[PDB]
Design a protein around this ligand. Structure first.
Ligand SMILES: [Mg+2]
Ligand SMILES: [Zn+2]
Ligand SMILES: [Zn+2]
Ligand SMILES: [Zn+2]
Lengths: 901, 1101
């Protein structure tokens, strides 16, 4: 019954086609009468359609929202050149004879080039090259070979002006202008047998059609007038331009009928050509664009199809959609990673159409009884005939009893529904994922915290959109392909993207660190909070004084791991490689060490798990953090996505409880260095400044050694920067060593939860050099940055070296230099975002339609083979073991531990 | 010896005496005083095409802010009256017409040429010179600084454009073509002409002139200006042997031209191809007259000075070629000049008055032609009076100010004044905007120049694409206004300068420039600059004069123009500051003012040019004999919002920028006039508080009278998972007791328009008969006069003002329902209802609805240290932990953002707030002179607490103390106007746009969310084809069409005959149904609107 568009073939409309497809000829340059009805024969004639309410289009009946529209046409008094085809017209004219109209080529050469063209001309670039060669060959012949006649050169003047350099008496040219009628007559007599040599097609196009004599009129529905709030019709730009065109055409016809002087007719012809070329393209090169009454440039047909707001990119590749909601986001760690909290206000506004079946009749009946105001209600019912009824308080019970098999109910959202959950900009494919609905009282979307990294979202005012699929197939696609737990492993590098962040890692470290112990109530409460289905506590690890039992953090954490997991590695807390080397030796000598032997050598820097029992090490970003996650990566591959989801939920909740009930804070004393450290830092800074001063003094008397390839000044600058960077690193070396593991900021930095050592060394010891675009500050007065320094001073302080820390405070010059430094980062991000976006758009448009075939090859839509095996090994990067096609070591090790057990 | 506190005592007097909006008020006053007369004198007078008749202009004056009542007479107008009535706060302009008959003048006649909008609190405004008890009775806020315009009831503020300094020779390298270019922008009567002289690889100089197709030969164009002698060329350019050798080469290359007439004819050929010889000659001499450096004049006698200026430009180019001088460095401030309100208004008045004089001349010509001659000559007074059309001037000026579109291509000069709070308004009144394009990188222009010190705030800048292009004046900044140029020139001449016409610039002689134009030469430059400095400090000449000398090039620059940015400094003489302790005492007692200190030679303003020769010390205790000036107050280099942050030097620069930007968005009692204000949006914090830790500048600027935040008891602790990733947790009991509780305002407007033909709207209850009649439910709160009762609670889409409109001719005998209703998702209580009359006498009704906004989830809170977040959870009080000293946190923040953000200043403010609240008095948090951290830490220990600021807390659930000591203090926090109640938005089906038949745009009209092409690419990357088609067709737009497969053209379905047929080919047998998007059908129609013919090939399945 229903057919689909299989292919589209383009071409050029002939005057006969335009005349036949038209519904009316336009003759009056007006739109509406005084009262408000369309003027008969006007640019708003009802033949083209109706846009005003309560009007029937006589062409096809209909109404304002029903009539699709019909084309009109204008009979131009004299032909004009189409601006889009002017360059092609020039290409054609200088390549064909003026008399016979044949291509100015020799017959055997024509045969050779026809043989060449048929060799797969479908490739556009090669066809263009061949046509360019033909044009170049035909340009350089003054005499037609087919018939005896001289050929004058033709000069093209933009936008649509053609000059003919024809000689005269006493051998002088007068650059005759070619009128459009002459050009059309020249083009008309071109035979079809050599049209392919010109790049045209005898059927889809003709050279004489490129000079148009009848201009089609777009339908009224394509030119919707807006009734302004003042009560005055705001005409669309196209309608106004059409009115101008009709007025000029009428004046030209009247003048021609009246025998006007030749110059007047020529001027009117040029004016009509200008109006037409502006209507087709108002941004055509070489013309002054037409302007509105307000002085703004008009928008015409060419403008609608171009730009980010144009048709192709604004209403075709993307558009505004129904059944969508947008509001701010707020954290919620108590829901599963594949669930989203939805406001009750949104849930009662969005609806999911559902069909009545034998297994859901009672629930739909109850919802229909609930009405559109109770939360689990409905807003509309659709009978099997297809009529839409709105549920109202007077219709609840009657419609509920009318409900039967085959009806449709537009119920409110429920728990367990599937929705699309999106953040902009959509940089990569896991920017949109499917979540399970969980209704909430307040007015913000609730998002689990482990799902933040894929969305690149933080709760500082970000807004994220939600979409509800309306059809069963779309819901199935969202449920199967787009579930959050499916996309734990990133396709970019084969590593986890969803994982613990910040407090998760910090709480894990607090729980699994050496010396951590918990009481009976703490263990029971934290296990119940995490959701673990335990019914009997394990044996106490140690007994406190007064006889109280105590449990270590390792034992509690081990209850979340799968029963048979085994792995060992080195985490970011490794500081004494001998301790790790001893454990590695003990594990290597026998693949199953005695746990009571490992516990004697247990060290926080070396994680080792034996049959689900955590025997050494501490939680770190390598444990389950997104970038370095190993336990999560092993679990998701060896046990499926659901077990990974359960593990992730349990560990997140457990670490959150630990960090809540143990207490975790930072204060002003976290950077309180002892006096000896401050003295050491001042010593380092003074030594660096003295070295810089010595270098400058050596430079000022020409004793400096010029480094290869560089100017002497550049060598001095590079040496100074090297010295300053070395000084800052040396200060950081002692700043790190004096702040021990007991400091909460150091815990946050070393475990990778937040920040790095640079922040600590800047806050506690030294800011260091400030530079813009990789070079020292120079953009001030002549020879100096600030007027507070002597001109010509090259010292470290005078060029941007800040010797203070954020804690000790910055002098005004240091503050100004720091602002200079920060501005460069701000502008760098501002420009880099746009550049990256444009490059990504180019890449997307280049590589969009490639796909893997059933035979394993990657083929272009035209059938061209790009790869004979995707990625040359056939392995999906998402499913790869961190780039590797397969991890042989892990498989061998796990098999051996499984069987040796 | 003076101390920084003594310097602060002097510093605050500057703001006390001058204010904060001097840049607008002084410029507008100068405009009103002189610019109108200057522009009038420029035109001279009307020259109608009437025999033996002419009109000469006289004086111009401004009347008083008035308004011509339609059914009445002129009456006084006040700003609050104009705001409510949507009028224009303007005053009439009166001009004198002097009739000239037979070349003889007679008695003048004064006519009204239009209305000029009045800047608020200017010397011609009614509010000027009034006291606080009078401003209060007039409805104004005494704290209002003025300095803006009121156009049709909206507050328009003109920002200052940052242009290149006029008449400045800037030299740059054209490395692309390996050339050297010097550029000047010559200004005369507003017109700008970019004139450039360049040296290409050939070593030959060429001159670029406006309205000239290709660059002409330098020697040729110089010959065209007379001075044809080759020796004259060599002397005009310079005297250096290498310079004269290069000029010998150029002259040899230019031996082709002979006389000035040949050059004129050559330029005529250049400018007017194909025309008669005389026409080209005359119209090329015209170009020489008024396109080649017009600022030198347009007289034919001005040849010699123009030639000398061009020769000096060429000398600069060749000197750059030889490496004798460096690049211009146009980023330097000496090359930058601000375009104040007065200059722009002068330009607008110039263009409007040009239009007006054209219209007047046309009118008088028409009247003489059509009435006759004896009529016009019998009553000249009537003939002149009834021919002026003031509306032509008024409409253009009003539209240009309202829209922000300026003649000459300038856009965005006039912006809507921001009225969110005190800081936002004051910061908006002090902005400098670069005219560049935002989209380009512009790495050199966005950077913070070294000369910005003390002239532009280093931190207060926008965040997005405008970063670095929009900047705010510092507190020390002062903007000059031009003095008469001729007096300065004569004074400089009397000091011993010989005119340039006398002797050539011998390198033994210094060059002297006055506002960029060479005026003579002196033997010693340093003696001249010392001589001028002595007079400037003594008081012999105006203070706006700045003088600087460049030793290397032997040039002396004297600046007296308009728009320079300067800063005050204490003059240091022989290692001793001129400011003494008794001067500070006199300033404190009120005996001595800031202007007196300026006139006493103690403090002088330095622009960028003069500061090149200075050597300024930072602090009084580091001054030595080398220093020439002393910094008044280093903490005042920051902008106004940036001064709010306490201890700004302890935070990273990006965080300070974020805090300064967010300080303009927080709620608070912005103005005491808010109750009767008619702003579109408004806010009101219920219990604003003064910050406990504050900078002493904020009290001086008046911020403490209008605070915009509250003090919170903040504990840094990871209470749960509900505060991660910059989320915050707030106490429920404190919210219920009035913490951060706010009120939201919104004003609706309704006009009773009067249409042509006598039809008009009407306020009434809509009858059920009228079309568009919405449910009777929505008229529940209306009175019989058609207006809502105040203090009645309303809901979404409830009707506020009932109004019916004349019908539309498709019906007839109907009345459209055009009531004004509440926005679809808003709610509140009607606060006040106002009935007024518009400028045309039609009734105007304005209704404001207030809404209580209790804090909830998703509301945004931000401290002034750049730390921002949203409320993640609201916790009952008994669940919150409590300190063992009896304190319960008002707010809990995550300790994780602190190390990454590196905002130590917030941690210091936390200690300072509790120290201030415990000692009973506030703590000073000035930028570089605030109370040091070590003092506060010791004082906290003195009061009995621990010096680290850590207290022992007990868990609110388990009832046992936490293992670690918790940092707790008091921090100033601000509620931002980004409330979730205004951001939530959901669309079920909604209405659709007319053209594309897709969902509308925006929350206000039930619009739909944008589904961008990037989302489509994401969907494709997931491989979900059916999800993509569902999102892209059914939810947005889809339709069925009839396609004739024989020819591919879309067939026509006729609803008259129940028949489908193809018009283009007459086919009825094969018309298949096709399903496609409506937008694609529109695309096909657009292509068929051109000559494109897209054929459609159908297929089965
Ligand atoms: Mg964010
Ligand atoms: Zn129709
Ligand atoms: Zn031929
Ligand atoms: Zn057909």
């Amino acid at each position: 019954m229903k057919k689909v568009i299989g292919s589209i073939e383009f071409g050029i409309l002939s005057p006969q086609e335009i005349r036949k497809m038209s519904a009316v000829e336009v003759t009056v340059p007006d739109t509406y009468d005084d009262d408000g009805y369309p003027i008969e024969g006007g640019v708003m004639d009802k033949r083209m359609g109706v846009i005003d309410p309560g009007l029937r289009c006589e062409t096809c009946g209909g109404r304002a929202g029903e009539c699709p529209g019909h084309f009109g046409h204008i009979e131009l008094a004299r032909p004009v050149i189409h601006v889009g085809f002017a360059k092609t017209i020039y290409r054609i004219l200088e390549s064909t004879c003026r008399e016979c109209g044949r291509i100015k080529l020799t017959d055997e050469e024509i045969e050779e080039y026809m043989k060449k063209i048929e060799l797969a001309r479908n490739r556009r670039s090669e066809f263009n090259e061949i046509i360019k060669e033909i044009h170049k060959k035909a340009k350089e012949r003054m005499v037609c070979p087919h018939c005896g006649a001289p050929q004058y050169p033709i000069k093209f003047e933009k936008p649509t002006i053609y000059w003919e350099i024809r000689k005269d008496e006493q051998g002088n040219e007068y650059r005759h202008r070619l009128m459009p009628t002459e050009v059309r007559d020249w083009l008309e007599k071109i035979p079809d047998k050599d049209l392919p040599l010109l790049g045209l097609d005898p059927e889809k196009s003709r050279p004489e059609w490129m000079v148009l004599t009848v201009l089609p009129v777009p339908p009224v529905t394509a030119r919707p007038s807006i009734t302004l709030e003042t009560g005055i019709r705001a005409e669309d730009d196209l309608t106004h331009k059409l009115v101008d065109i009709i007025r000029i055409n009428n004046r030209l016809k009247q003048n021609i009928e009246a025998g006007a002087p030749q110059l007047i007719i020529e001027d009117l012809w040029d004016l009509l050509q200008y109006h037409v070329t502006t209507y087709i393209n108002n941004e055509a090169p070489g013309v002054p664009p037409a302007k509105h009454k307000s002085g703004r440039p008009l928008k015409t047909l060419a403008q609608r199809l171009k730009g980010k707001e144009g048709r192709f990119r604004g209403n075709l590749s993307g558009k505004r959609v129904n059944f969508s909601a947008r509001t701010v986001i707020s954290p919620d760690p108590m829901i599963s990673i594949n669930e989203v909290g939805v406001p009750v206000e949104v849930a009662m506004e969005l609806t999911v159409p559902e069909k009545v079946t034998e297994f859901n009749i009672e629930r739909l009946r109850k919802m229909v009884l609930n009405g559109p105001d109770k939360y689990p209600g409905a807003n509309y019912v659709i009978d099997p005939e297809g009529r839409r009824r709105r549920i109202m308080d007077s219709n609840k019970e009657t419609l509920a009893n009318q409900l039967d098999i085959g009806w449709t109910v537009e119920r409110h959202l429920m728990d367990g529904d599937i929705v699309l959950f999106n953040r902009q900009p959509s940089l990569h494919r896991m920017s949109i994922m499917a979540h399970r609905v969980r209704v909430m009282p307040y007015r913000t979307f609730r998002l689990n915290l482990a799902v933040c990294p894929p969305y690149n979202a933080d709760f500082d005012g970000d807004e994220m959109n939600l979409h509800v699929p309306q059809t069963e197939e779309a819901q199935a696609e969202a449920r199967i392909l787009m579930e959050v737990q499916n996309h734990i492993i990133s396709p970019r590098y084969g590593g986890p993207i969803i994982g613990g962040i910040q407090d998760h890692i910090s709480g894990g470290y607090l729980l699994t660190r050496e010396g951590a112990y918990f009481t009976r109530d703490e263990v029971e409460q934290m296990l119940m909070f995490a959701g673990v289905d335990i019914t009997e506590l394990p044996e106490p690890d140690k007994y406190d004084e007064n006889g109280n039992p105590l449990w270590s953090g390792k034992t509690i954490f081990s209850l979340l791991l799968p029963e048979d997991l085994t792995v060992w590695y080195r985490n970011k807390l490794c500081d004494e490689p001998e301790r790790c080397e001893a454990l590695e030796k003990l594990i290597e000598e026998k693949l199953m060490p005695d746990p009571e032997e490992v516990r004697k050598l247990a060290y926080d820097g070396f994680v080792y798990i034996q049959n689900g029992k955590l025997l050494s090490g501490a939680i770190d970003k390598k444990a389950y953090g997104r970038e370095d996650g190993i336990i999560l990566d092993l679990i998701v591959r060896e046990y499926g996505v659901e077990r990974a989801r359960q593990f992730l939920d349990q560990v997140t909740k457990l670490t959150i409880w630990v960090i809540t009930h143990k207490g975790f804070t930072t204060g002003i004393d976290d950077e309180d260095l002892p006096e000896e450290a401050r003295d050491r830092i001042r010593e380092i800074i003074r030594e660096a400044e003295e070295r810089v001063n010595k270098l400058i003094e050596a430079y000022k008397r020409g004793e400096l050694e010029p480094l290869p390839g560089k100017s002497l000044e550049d060598t001095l600058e590079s040496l100074i920067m090297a010295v300053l960077a070395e000084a800052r690193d040396n200060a950081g070396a002692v700043a790190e060593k004096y702040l021990g593991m007991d400091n909460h900021t150091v815990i946050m930095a070393k475990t990778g939860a937040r920040g790095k050592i640079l922040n600590i060394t800047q806050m506690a010891a030294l800011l260091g050099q400030q530079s813009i675009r990789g070079k020292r500050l120079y953009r001030g007065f002549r020879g100096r940055v600030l007027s507070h320094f002597k001109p010509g001073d090259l010292g470290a302080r005078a060029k941007g070296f800040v010797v203070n820390s954020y804690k000790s405070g910055l002098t005004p010059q240091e503050y100004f230099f720091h602002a200079m430094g920060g501005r460069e980062g701000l502008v760098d991000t501002a420009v880099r975002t746009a550049q990256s976006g444009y490059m990504q758009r180019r890449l997307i448009n280049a590589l969009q339609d490639l796909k893997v075939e059933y035979d394993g090859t990657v083929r272009s839509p035209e059938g061209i083979i790009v790869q004979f095996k995707y990625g040359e090994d056939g392995v999906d990067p998402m499913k790869s073991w961190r780039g590797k096609t397969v991890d042989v070591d892990r498989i061998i090790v796990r098999t051996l531990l499984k069987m040796r057990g | 010896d003076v101390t920084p506190d003594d310097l602060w005592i002097v510093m605050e007097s500057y703001w006390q005496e001058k204010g904060l909006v001097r840049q607008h008020l002084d410029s507008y006053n100068a405009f009103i005083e002189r610019g109108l007369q200057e522009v009038v004198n420029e035109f001279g007078g009307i020259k109608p095409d009437i025999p033996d008749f002419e009109v000469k202009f006289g004086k111009i004056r401004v009347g008083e802010p008035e308004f011509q009542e339609p059914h009445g007479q002129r009456k006084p107008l006040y700003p609050m009256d104009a705001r409510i009535r949507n009028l224009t706060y303007a005053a009439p302009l009166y001009l004198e017409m002097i009739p000239v008959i037979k070349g003889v003048e007679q008695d003048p006649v004064e006519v009204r040429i239009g209305e000029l909008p009045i800047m608020l609190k200017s010397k011609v405004c009614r509010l000027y010179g009034l006291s606080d008890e009078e401003l209060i009775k007039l409805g104004e806020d005494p704290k209002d600084p003025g300095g803006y315009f009121i156009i049709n009831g909206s507050e328009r503020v003109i920002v200052s454009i940052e242009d290149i300094a006029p008449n400045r020779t800037l030299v740059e390298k054209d490395e692309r073509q390996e050339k050297y270019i010097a550029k000047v922008f010559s200004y005369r009567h507003g017109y700008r002409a970019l004139v450039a002289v360049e040296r290409r690889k050939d070593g030959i100089l060429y001159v670029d002139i406006p309205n000239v197709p290709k660059p002409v030969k330098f020697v040729y164009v110089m010959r065209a200006l007379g001075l044809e002698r080759d020796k004259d060329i060599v002397e005009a350019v310079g005297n250096d042997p290498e310079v004269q050798q290069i000029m010998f080469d150029n002259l040899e290359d230019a031996s082709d031209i002979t006389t000035q007439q040949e050059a004129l004819e050559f330029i005529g050929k250049l400018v007017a191809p194909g025309q008669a010889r005389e026409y080209r000659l005359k119209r090329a001499e015209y170009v020489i007259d008024n396109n080649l450096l017009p600022h030198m004049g347009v007289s034919p006698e001005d040849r010699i000075k123009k030639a000398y200026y061009l020769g000096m430009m060429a000398l600069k180019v060749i000197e750059l070629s030889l490496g004798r001088r460096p690049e211009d460095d146009k980023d330097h401030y000496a090359n930058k000049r601000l375009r104040l309100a007065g200059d722009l208004l002068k330009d607008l008045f110039r263009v409007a008055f040009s239009q007006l004089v054209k219209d007047i001349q046309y009118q008088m010509t028409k009247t003489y032609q059509r009435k006759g001659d004896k009529y016009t000559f019998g009553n000249i007074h009537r003939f002149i009076r009834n021919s002026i059309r003031p509306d032509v001037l008024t409409e253009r000026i009003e539209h240009a100010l309202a829209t922000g579109a300026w003649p000459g291509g300038r856009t965005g000069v006039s912006q809507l004044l921001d009225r969110t709070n005190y800081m936002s308004t004051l910061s908006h009144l002090r902005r400098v905007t670069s005219p560049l394009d935002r989209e380009q990188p512009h790495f050199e222009a966005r950077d913070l120049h070294g000369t910005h010190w003390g002239r532009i705030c280093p931190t207060e800048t926008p965040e997005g694409p405008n970063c670095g292009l929009v900047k705010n004046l510092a507190l020390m900044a002062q903007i000059t206004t031009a003095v008469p140029e001729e007096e300065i020139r004569e004074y400089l001449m009397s000091l011993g300068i010989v005119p340039i016409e006398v002797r050539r610039p011998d390198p033994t002689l210094w060059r002297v420039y006055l506002n960029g134009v060479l005026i003579g030469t002196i033997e010693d430059g340093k003696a001249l600059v010392q001589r001028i400095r002595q007079d400037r400090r003594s008081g012999k000449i105006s203070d706006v004069i700045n003088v600087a000398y460049y030793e290397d090039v032997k040039e002396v620059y004297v600046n007296s123009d308009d728009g320079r940015v300067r800063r005050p400094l204490i003059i240091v003489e022989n290692g001793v500051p001129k400011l003494t302790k008794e001067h500070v005492q006199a300033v404190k007692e009120g005996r001595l003012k800031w202007s007196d200190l300026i006139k006493m030679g103690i403090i002088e303003y330095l622009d960028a040019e003069e500061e090149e020769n200075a050597y300024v010390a930072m602090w009084p205790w580091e001054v030595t004999e080398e220093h020439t000036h002393l910094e008044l107050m280093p903490a005042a280099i920051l902008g106004l919002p940036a001064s709010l942050v306490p201890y700004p030097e302890h935070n990273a620069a990006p965080r300070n920028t974020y805090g300064a930007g967010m300080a303009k968005q927080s709620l608070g009692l912005g103005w005491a006039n808010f109750r009767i204000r008619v702003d579109t949006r408004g806010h009101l914090l219920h219990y604003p508080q003064i910050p406990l830790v504050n900078s002493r500048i904020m009290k001086a600027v008046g911020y403490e009278d209008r605070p915009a935040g509250q003090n919170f008891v903040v504990a840094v602790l990871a209470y749960q998972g509900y505060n991660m990733e910059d989320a915050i947790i707030i106490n429920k009991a404190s919210i219920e007791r009035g913490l951060a509780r706010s009120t939201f305002f919104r004003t609706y407007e309704a006009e009773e328009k009067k249409y042509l033909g006598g039809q008009t709207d009407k306020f009434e209850i809509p009858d059920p008969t009228v079309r568009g009649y919405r449910g009777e439910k929505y008229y529940r709160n209306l009175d019989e006069d058609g207006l809502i009762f105040p203090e009645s609670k309303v809901e979404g889409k409830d009707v506020l003002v009932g109004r019916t409109s004349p019908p539309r001719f498709l019906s007839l005998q109907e009345r459209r329902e055009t009531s004004v209703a509440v926005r679809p998702s808003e709610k509140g209580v009607v606060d006040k209802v106002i009935i007024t009359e518009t400028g045309d006498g039609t009734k105007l009704v304005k209704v404001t609805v207030r809404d209580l906004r209790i804090p909830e989830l998703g509301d945004k809170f931000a401290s002034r240290h750049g730390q921002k977040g949203v409320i993640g959870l609201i916790v009952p009080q008994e669940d919150m932990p409590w300190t063992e000293s009896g304190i319960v946190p008002d707010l809990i923040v995550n300790p994780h953002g602190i190390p990454s953000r590196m905002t130590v200043g917030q941690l210091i403010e936390a200690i300072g707030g509790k120290v201030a609240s415990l000692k009973g008095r506030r703590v000073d948090g000035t930028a570089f002179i605030g109370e040091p951290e070590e003092k506060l830490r010791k004082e906290l220990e003195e009061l009995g607490f621990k010096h680290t600021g850590r207290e022992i807390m007990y868990d609110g659930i388990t009832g046992k103390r936490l293992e670690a000591d918790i940092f707790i203090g008091v921090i100033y926090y601000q509620r931002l106007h980004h409330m979730v109640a205004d951001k939530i938005h959901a669309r079920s089906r909604g209405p659709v746009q007319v053209l594309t038949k897709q969902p509308t745009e925006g929350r206000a009209r039930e619009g739909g969310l944008r589904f961008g092409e990037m989302e489509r690419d994401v969907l494709v990357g997931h491989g979900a084809a059916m999800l993509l088609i569902e999102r892209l067709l059914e939810e947005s737009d889809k339709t069925e069409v009839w396609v004739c497969e024989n020819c591919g053209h879309i067939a026509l379905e006729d609803k008259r005959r129940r028949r489908v047929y193809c018009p283009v080919c007459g086919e009825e047998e094969r018309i298949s149904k096709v399903e496609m998007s409506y937008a694609f059908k529109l695309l096909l129609d657009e292509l068929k609107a051109m000559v494109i013919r897209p054929k459609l090939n159908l297929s089965e399945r």
